[PDB]
Design a protein around this ligand. Structure first.
Ligand SMILES: [Mg+2]
Ligand SMILES: [Mg+2]
Ligand SMILES: [Mg+2]
Ligand SMILES: [Mg+2]
Ligand SMILES: [Mg+2]
Ligand SMILES: [Mg+2]
Ligand SMILES: [Mg+2]
Ligand SMILES: [Mg+2]
Ligand SMILES: [Mg+2]
Ligand SMILES: [Mg+2]
Ligand SMILES: [Mg+2]
Ligand SMILES: [Mg+2]
Ligand SMILES: [Mg+2]
Ligand SMILES: [Mg+2]
Ligand SMILES: [Mg+2]
Ligand SMILES: [Mg+2]
Ligand SMILES: [Mg+2]
Ligand SMILES: [Mg+2]
Ligand SMILES: [Mg+2]
Ligand SMILES: [Mg+2]
Ligand SMILES: [Mg+2]
Ligand SMILES: [Mg+2]
Ligand SMILES: [Mg+2]
Ligand SMILES: [Mg+2]
Ligand SMILES: [Mg+2]
Ligand SMILES: [Mg+2]
Ligand SMILES: [Mg+2]
Ligand SMILES: [Mg+2]
Ligand SMILES: [Mg+2]
Ligand SMILES: [Mg+2]
Ligand SMILES: [Mg+2]
Ligand SMILES: [Mg+2]
Ligand SMILES: [Mg+2]
Ligand SMILES: [Mg+2]
Ligand SMILES: [Mg+2]
Ligand SMILES: [Mg+2]
Ligand SMILES: [Mg+2]
Ligand SMILES: [Mg+2]
Ligand SMILES: [Mg+2]
Ligand SMILES: [Mg+2]
Ligand SMILES: [Mg+2]
Ligand SMILES: [Mg+2]
Ligand SMILES: [Mg+2]
Ligand SMILES: [Mg+2]
Ligand SMILES: [Mg+2]
Ligand SMILES: [Mg+2]
Ligand SMILES: [Mg+2]
Ligand SMILES: [Mg+2]
Ligand SMILES: [Mg+2]
Ligand SMILES: [Mg+2]
Ligand SMILES: [Mg+2]
Ligand SMILES: [Mg+2]
Ligand SMILES: [Mg+2]
Ligand SMILES: [Mg+2]
Ligand SMILES: [Mg+2]
Ligand SMILES: [Mg+2]
Ligand SMILES: [Mg+2]
Ligand SMILES: [Mg+2]
Ligand SMILES: [Mg+2]
Ligand SMILES: [Mg+2]
Ligand SMILES: [Mg+2]
Ligand SMILES: [Mg+2]
Ligand SMILES: [Mg+2]
Ligand SMILES: [Mg+2]
Ligand SMILES: [Mg+2]
Ligand SMILES: [Mg+2]
Ligand SMILES: [Mg+2]
Ligand SMILES: [Mg+2]
Ligand SMILES: [Mg+2]
Ligand SMILES: [Mg+2]
Ligand SMILES: [Mg+2]
Ligand SMILES: [Mg+2]
Ligand SMILES: [Mg+2]
Ligand SMILES: [Mg+2]
Ligand SMILES: [Mg+2]
Ligand SMILES: [Mg+2]
Ligand SMILES: [Mg+2]
Ligand SMILES: [Mg+2]
Ligand SMILES: [Mg+2]
Ligand SMILES: [Mg+2]
Ligand SMILES: [Mg+2]
Ligand SMILES: [Mg+2]
Ligand SMILES: [Mg+2]
Ligand SMILES: [Mg+2]
Ligand SMILES: [Mg+2]
Ligand SMILES: [Mg+2]
Ligand SMILES: [Mg+2]
Ligand SMILES: [Mg+2]
Ligand SMILES: [Mg+2]
Ligand SMILES: [Mg+2]
Ligand SMILES: [Mg+2]
Ligand SMILES: [Mg+2]
Ligand SMILES: [Mg+2]
Ligand SMILES: [Mg+2]
Ligand SMILES: [Mg+2]
Ligand SMILES: [Mg+2]
Ligand SMILES: [Mg+2]
Ligand SMILES: [Mg+2]
Ligand SMILES: [Mg+2]
Ligand SMILES: [Mg+2]
Ligand SMILES: [Mg+2]
Ligand SMILES: [Mg+2]
Ligand SMILES: [Mg+2]
Ligand SMILES: [Mg+2]
Ligand SMILES: [Mg+2]
Ligand SMILES: [Mg+2]
Ligand SMILES: [Mg+2]
Ligand SMILES: [Mg+2]
Ligand SMILES: [Mg+2]
Ligand SMILES: [Mg+2]
Ligand SMILES: [Mg+2]
Ligand SMILES: [Mg+2]
Ligand SMILES: [Mg+2]
Ligand SMILES: [Mg+2]
Ligand SMILES: [Mg+2]
Ligand SMILES: [Mg+2]
Ligand SMILES: [Mg+2]
Ligand SMILES: [Mg+2]
Ligand SMILES: [Mg+2]
Ligand SMILES: [Mg+2]
Ligand SMILES: [Mg+2]
Ligand SMILES: [Mg+2]
Ligand SMILES: [Mg+2]
Ligand SMILES: [Mg+2]
Ligand SMILES: [Mg+2]
Ligand SMILES: [Mg+2]
Ligand SMILES: [Mg+2]
Ligand SMILES: [Mg+2]
Ligand SMILES: [Mg+2]
Ligand SMILES: [Mg+2]
Ligand SMILES: [Mg+2]
Ligand SMILES: [Mg+2]
Ligand SMILES: [Mg+2]
Ligand SMILES: [Mg+2]
Ligand SMILES: [Mg+2]
Ligand SMILES: [Mg+2]
Ligand SMILES: [Mg+2]
Length: 68
RNA sequence: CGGCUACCCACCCGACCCGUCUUGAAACACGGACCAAGGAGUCUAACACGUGCGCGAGUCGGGGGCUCGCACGAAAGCCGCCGUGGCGCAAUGAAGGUGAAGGCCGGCGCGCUCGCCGGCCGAGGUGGGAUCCCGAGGCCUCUCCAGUCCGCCGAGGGGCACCACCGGCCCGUCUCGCCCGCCGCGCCGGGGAGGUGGAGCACGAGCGCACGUGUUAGGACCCGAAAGAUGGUGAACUAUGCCUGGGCAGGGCGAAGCCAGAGGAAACUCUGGUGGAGGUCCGUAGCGGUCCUGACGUGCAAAUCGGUCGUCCGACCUGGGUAUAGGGGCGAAAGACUAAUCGAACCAUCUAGUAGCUGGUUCCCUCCGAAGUUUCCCUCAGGAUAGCUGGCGCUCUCGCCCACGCAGUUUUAUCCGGUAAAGCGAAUGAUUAGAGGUCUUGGGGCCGAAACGAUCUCAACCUAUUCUCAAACUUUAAAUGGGUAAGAAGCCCGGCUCGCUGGCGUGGAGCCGGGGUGGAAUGCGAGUGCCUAGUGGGCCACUUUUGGUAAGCAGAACUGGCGCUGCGGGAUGAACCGAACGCCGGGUUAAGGCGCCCGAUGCCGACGCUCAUCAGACCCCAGAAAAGGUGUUGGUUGAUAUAGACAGCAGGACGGUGGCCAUGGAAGUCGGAAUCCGCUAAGGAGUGUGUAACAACUCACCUGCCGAAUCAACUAGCCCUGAAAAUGGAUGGCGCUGGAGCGUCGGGCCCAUACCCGGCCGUCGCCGGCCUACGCCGCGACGAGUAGGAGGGCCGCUGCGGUGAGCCUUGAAGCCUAGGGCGCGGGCCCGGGUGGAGCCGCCGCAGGUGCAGAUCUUGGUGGUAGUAGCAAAUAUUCAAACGAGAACUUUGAAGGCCGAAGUGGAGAAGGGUUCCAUGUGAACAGCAGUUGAACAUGGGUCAGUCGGUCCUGAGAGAUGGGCG
RNA sequence: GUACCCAUAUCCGCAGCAGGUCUCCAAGGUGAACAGCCUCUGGCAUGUUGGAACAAUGUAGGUAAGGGAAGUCGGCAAGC
RNA sequence: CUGUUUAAUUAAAACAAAGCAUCGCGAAGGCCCGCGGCGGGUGUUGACGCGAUGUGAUUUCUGCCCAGUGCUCUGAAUGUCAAAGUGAAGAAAUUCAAUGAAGCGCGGGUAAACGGCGGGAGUAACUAUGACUCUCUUAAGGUAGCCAAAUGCCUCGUCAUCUAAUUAGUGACGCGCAUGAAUGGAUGAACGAGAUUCCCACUGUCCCUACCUACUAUCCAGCGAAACCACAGCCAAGGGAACGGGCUUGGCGGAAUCAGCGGGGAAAGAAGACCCUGUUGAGCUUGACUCUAGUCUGGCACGGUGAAGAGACAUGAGAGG
RNA sequence: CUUCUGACCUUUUGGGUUUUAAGCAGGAGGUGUCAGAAAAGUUACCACAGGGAUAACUGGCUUGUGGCGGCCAAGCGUUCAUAGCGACGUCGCUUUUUGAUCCUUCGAUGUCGGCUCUUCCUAUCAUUGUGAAGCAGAAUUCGCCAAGCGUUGGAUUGUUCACCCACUAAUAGGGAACGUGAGCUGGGUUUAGACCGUCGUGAGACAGGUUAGUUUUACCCUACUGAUGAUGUGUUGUUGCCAUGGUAAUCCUGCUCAGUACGAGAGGAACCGCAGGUUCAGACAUUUGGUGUAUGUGCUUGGCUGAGGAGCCAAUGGGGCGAAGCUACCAUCUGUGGGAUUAUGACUGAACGCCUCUAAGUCAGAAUCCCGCCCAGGCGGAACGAUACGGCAGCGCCGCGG
């Protein structure tokens, strides 16, 4: 009652029935896995960007609109 | 005259019998004699998904109540202070419990890696994002002027659905830190900043109804078992006890006891009768069954018969009553018997037990369409998961110098490898041979008391070489192959934030604003979500390989095919070569072929090879080698020949020297070593034959005649030998030799469902029109397919509600039909005939809804087939009679059998009118009948003294009592 | 209760089935015998069919010149 | 020995048998039945009886081992050993400690209980064979007997006899794979429908077949089924699921039949009795797992009165190293 | 599930305290069949559902192995390789042994051997014709054409195989599903009974040994043997051909040749001719032997017809003979030759001045082959005869018109 054990015949033809797909697109890539000390940098940097970017960038926009 | 047609026949070509298990079916695999009816995926509950409807942060009366007593009303209508309740709107924790809003501006405490007060907005931001809005500008018969008008658009803005990321809030644990409050200051509560797990929030989409698919539990697609339990029925067969009865022909052997006689001293012994003993011998009835493995062996019989048998006074055979009843009984023990069943009886119930295991599974058309593979399982005939597949969609993109993106592809750059190869005078492992050198010990020899005092030889070592390799060696290193990049998600500039880092505004990440998109080739319109069947036994072929001697063997890699697949060649074929399939007309071709089958060379085809007394005839493919050929055709290497060869004829073939090693010979001639000179025309210290040797013969060599080409060794094309198998046979056969064989080719010719054009059907994509919009057109590309999945059916059957002022006793359903027709098809309509009372079309609804199979169930009917068979036991014959009718009925007569253990006269059990008479002969008696045990009618059984009734036998049994 | 069968045709075996089922009575001859054979009383039509011929093969019975087990696993069967 | 046995494949070398023995039991008992009772069989019985066993007449015999598995007896002398009871800790549940019935072990017996019975080397005036002797080892080491047997793989062992010829028979030899003593050994008159070899007579078993009779088979009168059947039946070769009838290429092929014969139809009769698979069973067996009837014990109630003796705990006094 | 560790943790159900219990998080106790059930054996008394997914027969591929050939030749063969052989190597054939695979067969293909019977192959044992020897003759050995015909009786074993005796020209090798069981036999293998020896505690097992152990059916089709018949010639009869199918003859002994050739002897032929004999085939019964129911004759046993005579029955009562018929290698007769040729030996004669059996031509040439002889004669054809009264008929030749 010996049977055929293992083969990879008729496998690439099944693979190319659907055109094997790259993930091909991740705009603004996934962030998990990166260094937790770098995350402790980046989250506080982002929320203080939300806090204190207003007036200096506003005056810089006024200055660059006056210059050009 | 015309007619396709379920009519019949002939002709050319193709054509194995369907269904399934299978890699493979026409199979020497299985089911199927034929026909009619029935026959197999239903229903409930639960879940999930998709679709349609109503209401919608709600939804639902399914539970009851209200109406007057209504056939349809077991319907329907309503409740609302009947919403109790289910699901959802809130999750997280094991739990105590806790529980989803933030952002902007101004002020203060040292705007402190830090909390508070006042006002405003309100489910955040980034990049995409259908759509929408604004708009420079352009364009409509001659000028200024205009309003709607014809009319797009660079660029800009707000940004649904969803995608990707960041940030925020809730709960539980973890880390670090400070503050607040007091119906009471405590091992009391709450709050902050980070990293976490959750099926969460971040403007909610559910509930109910119905349909479709899938899964699960239920008998559950249909049929199927060996088995288990529960409760009853059997000792009329058989097994064994017990009671009660019955039976067993004749002979042979001759025990105990008894009588008489004889011998002896006694003890005692011997002889002739008599007697009838015995789990005794031959043998009958009876009981069993050894052998012929006889006859049957669809028989007389689901165990019998004929011979030959064993035993037959007994451990003998047997009737009736009774007792032992199923995991029990009984067993002179065979697991044998227990009602044709016994290694656990029979009947019913659980039960339609379960089966991963055989078989079957019912209308058509269209579209798409596999796999025998990964992993896991007490897994290997199975299942789960992933892959392959189908269906349902959603998000976008195009139609009006440039788009988003993708690829079994190439190129341009960039890396990666360790196989093929090659090498080992390169590491490792093997392995061959020679040379040189002198350090060293081991064995021989010389100078010689001995001495590395000197030297010859040998071994090992070293040096430079050289021979051959290595899947588990490698300096080097291919071809093929794999990854990445070829832009707006990319560059450049300027600036903020950081609690990361730190000489530094140093670096790095994030955030904000702006500038220019023409950045390899070719082709293609893309992304994404849900549900699910089948599959999980494979095989073959080129190339690379593992094991094996090899296999149509077993196991791997890439690709293709079969499976799942037709068609043209290979005669015949699963895989080979072409080439893939809707129905046809024309033309062309591939693979192949052109002597006849058999379409096409029947060309004044070309070149050359081949004789077989076993020719040869085209990948897989259906047979063959080493070796050999003065059989022929080329080719290479050479050597001879006018200073006349090759073959032919003729002549010579000596001297030293009978040399040397030998003596059984050698005086060239078995053998061992050699090898010259003279005469020369030339002789080889001799190529062979012999006479044992001594001698004759012959050859190399030489010369006379002849006359110009000759000889040798290899090589490869055809052919031959090598080449032997059983049924008679295979280039397919027939035949084929100036080819119809072989190798090279030229021009034509033939066709497949292949290709091009055209007609028709269908599917798909795009689209047209304000003509059943679910209809009507238009263009273009394609149609194959088992398992499986969808869509359509104005295919069909049954019944239900609407509906056709439907149909008809002037003929409905059903059935038959060499008739007419439609649709590709499921099927349908009409014509003709039997028939006599119900039937149909459309729209919705619900099925016990379609048959070729299942050793399918029931019923009927063929071939066999007027066949086998009416043959165990000796046998009938003549005349007459009743009678339509006599081999069979009856009588006379003749001949036989049973022959007293009967083929006779009567009984017990069992049968129940079969007993008797009359009448009929369809029915039964396996032919027949006037006959019978058949049929119909009418009769027949008389008891104090025959038996039961009475009695107990083995035993069965109730009360008293005990147990339950 | 009293008929009848009590059986190769009235029972059982699916049947007018070479199967099975318990008993009494028993003649003459030959013969030891209730053995086998032929007769008597008493029954019967040969056992679910008849006619014609006598082929192969078969089923039962009998023989065969000479050898006597040489055949066959075995003297199996048959015969003394 | 006579007898019995697998009805429907065995008739025996199988079973039974008398004889030989063994064990349990003196009745409140042995062996058993029963769901139950002091219910029943043995038992209308009492060791010359009942029940369970091995072997199987007569003669001669009954070798040696209790190491193992069994069976039995004994001592609370001593380890282990469950309920119930005693004491201590605590508020109690609970925990701990000693006390220790059966059984196991410790000790003895038993083999006419289950069973078992050795392999090495050197040795005698030719060679061999080899009593004797050394050594490992067990519990004992096969004794009296017997043999290529119904028991011997090699093996058709060797020798002798029967025959012309023998894998057959008979007799002997015996380190005998793997004979053997109630697992009974060795003989053994009579009897085997038991198995085998040889001899005389006898015959068709044959050489070597032939003939005759009865019945059937043949035909006719009457009456007449059954199995089986996808279709139906001419062969050779090739291919194919590797042996076809139907495919291909050849050989070819006349209607309808009768009597036979068995080459074929991989003929029919049965869902292979052989092999394997099933997470399918069933008879069994035991030192497989898990239970239980029965049975041996301890405790608790029925279960009560009197005396004597002993053990342990607690109290006080005296001796004691 | 158990155990341990940690929080001054949660719940211990109406409220508090304590013990206990449960939970939370992580370490261990283990699933070796290692992603994990807790598990001995037998069934020859076996059963069920399946499988040729999977063995035991054949058949199919291969030929390791077996068997049978070839190649070069160191040597054996007194000398001498190839008369006969041939070491070491090497190339092949076959499925007559065995092995390998599982392709078919599990809803069955009846599995060994023997008997009987038919056909085929040659790798030839003998016979016919041949060549070569270390072939003097005789007897052998090696090859070729060659399968036409033969290739025994027996003691043993179930035997296949194997050994032995005797005869003979010789006792050659095989195939046909390891030919053949709806042909037989059942001897063993291979059911159930049982015994011995070994293993196992035991049920039981033993390619260890010995006994007893059911062999079912043809009437279907085809094939084959035999017998009717069918088609066209108008019917029918007689006399005849053979196209085709088959094939039949084989072998040995004795006498002359001849005690001759040959050989020193020992020994010892051949050709023709003559008597025969073995096997096979066809017959036939005059004789012989069988059979015998002309139930023919004649005895005799037991019974029966009253006794004699005549008889009858006893499954043809017995046996003595026995006519006709069937039969026996148990009696007797018969079995027949022409051609082309294979192997081989040659002639003439080149290639290649010569040689040569060959390349074209020729000759001889055998159990091989074909034909004759002999069997049945074709969907084959001939020649000839009669060819339908009766009282009306009916039927043929010539030439006819519709
Ligand atoms: Mg597989
Ligand atoms: Mg398939
Ligand atoms: Mg198969
Ligand atoms: Mg098929
Ligand atoms: Mg079959
Ligand atoms: Mg079939
Ligand atoms: Mg069938
Ligand atoms: Mg139907
Ligand atoms: Mg929904
Ligand atoms: Mg509520
Ligand atoms: Mg059970
Ligand atoms: Mg019961
Ligand atoms: Mg009785
Ligand atoms: Mg008995
Ligand atoms: Mg007696
Ligand atoms: Mg006697
Ligand atoms: Mg006797
Ligand atoms: Mg009997
Ligand atoms: Mg009998
Ligand atoms: Mg018989
Ligand atoms: Mg018969
Ligand atoms: Mg008798
Ligand atoms: Mg007798
Ligand atoms: Mg007797
Ligand atoms: Mg027995
Ligand atoms: Mg038994
Ligand atoms: Mg029975
Ligand atoms: Mg059983
Ligand atoms: Mg039972
Ligand atoms: Mg069912
Ligand atoms: Mg069932
Ligand atoms: Mg698996
Ligand atoms: Mg299957
Ligand atoms: Mg799946
Ligand atoms: Mg999809
Ligand atoms: Mg799709
Ligand atoms: Mg290499
Ligand atoms: Mg499905
Ligand atoms: Mg393979
Ligand atoms: Mg294909
Ligand atoms: Mg495909
Ligand atoms: Mg073709
Ligand atoms: Mg071909
Ligand atoms: Mg065309
Ligand atoms: Mg071509
Ligand atoms: Mg043509
Ligand atoms: Mg040549
Ligand atoms: Mg050749
Ligand atoms: Mg030919
Ligand atoms: Mg050519
Ligand atoms: Mg299609
Ligand atoms: Mg009516
Ligand atoms: Mg209709
Ligand atoms: Mg139905
Ligand atoms: Mg209905
Ligand atoms: Mg039907
Ligand atoms: Mg079907
Ligand atoms: Mg049927
Ligand atoms: Mg029927
Ligand atoms: Mg009816
Ligand atoms: Mg019929
Ligand atoms: Mg008849
Ligand atoms: Mg009869
Ligand atoms: Mg009359
Ligand atoms: Mg009259
Ligand atoms: Mg009669
Ligand atoms: Mg009588
Ligand atoms: Mg009557
Ligand atoms: Mg009748
Ligand atoms: Mg009458
Ligand atoms: Mg009546
Ligand atoms: Mg009176
Ligand atoms: Mg009375
Ligand atoms: Mg009672
Ligand atoms: Mg009472
Ligand atoms: Mg009476
Ligand atoms: Mg009777
Ligand atoms: Mg009778
Ligand atoms: Mg008398
Ligand atoms: Mg007398
Ligand atoms: Mg009497
Ligand atoms: Mg009768
Ligand atoms: Mg005789
Ligand atoms: Mg005689
Ligand atoms: Mg004699
Ligand atoms: Mg004799
Ligand atoms: Mg014999
Ligand atoms: Mg006899
Ligand atoms: Mg006689
Ligand atoms: Mg018997
Ligand atoms: Mg005795
Ligand atoms: Mg007692
Ligand atoms: Mg003893
Ligand atoms: Mg002891
Ligand atoms: Mg000595
Ligand atoms: Mg001894
Ligand atoms: Mg003998
Ligand atoms: Mg022994
Ligand atoms: Mg012993
Ligand atoms: Mg014919
Ligand atoms: Mg054929
Ligand atoms: Mg093939
Ligand atoms: Mg074949
Ligand atoms: Mg064939
Ligand atoms: Mg067939
Ligand atoms: Mg045909
Ligand atoms: Mg075909
Ligand atoms: Mg016939
Ligand atoms: Mg027959
Ligand atoms: Mg059969
Ligand atoms: Mg089966
Ligand atoms: Mg399994
Ligand atoms: Mg079991
Ligand atoms: Mg596992
Ligand atoms: Mg047996
Ligand atoms: Mg070989
Ligand atoms: Mg197979
Ligand atoms: Mg096989
Ligand atoms: Mg395979
Ligand atoms: Mg057969
Ligand atoms: Mg022949
Ligand atoms: Mg065979
Ligand atoms: Mg036998
Ligand atoms: Mg036997
Ligand atoms: Mg034992
Ligand atoms: Mg017997
Ligand atoms: Mg007949
Ligand atoms: Mg002829
Ligand atoms: Mg003859
Ligand atoms: Mg005579
Ligand atoms: Mg007389
Ligand atoms: Mg007289
Ligand atoms: Mg008489
Ligand atoms: Mg008589
Ligand atoms: Mg007579
Ligand atoms: Mg006579
Ligand atoms: Mg010649």
């Amino acid at each position: 009652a010996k049977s055929k054990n293992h083969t990879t015949h008729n496998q690439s033809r099944k693979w190319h029935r659907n055109g094997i797909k790259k993930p091909r697109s991740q705009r603004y890539e996934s962030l998990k896995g990166v260094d937790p000390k770098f995350l402790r940098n980046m989250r506080f940097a982002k929320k203080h960007n939300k806090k204190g970017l207003k007036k200096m960038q506003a005056n810089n926009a006024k200055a660059m609109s006056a210059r050009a």
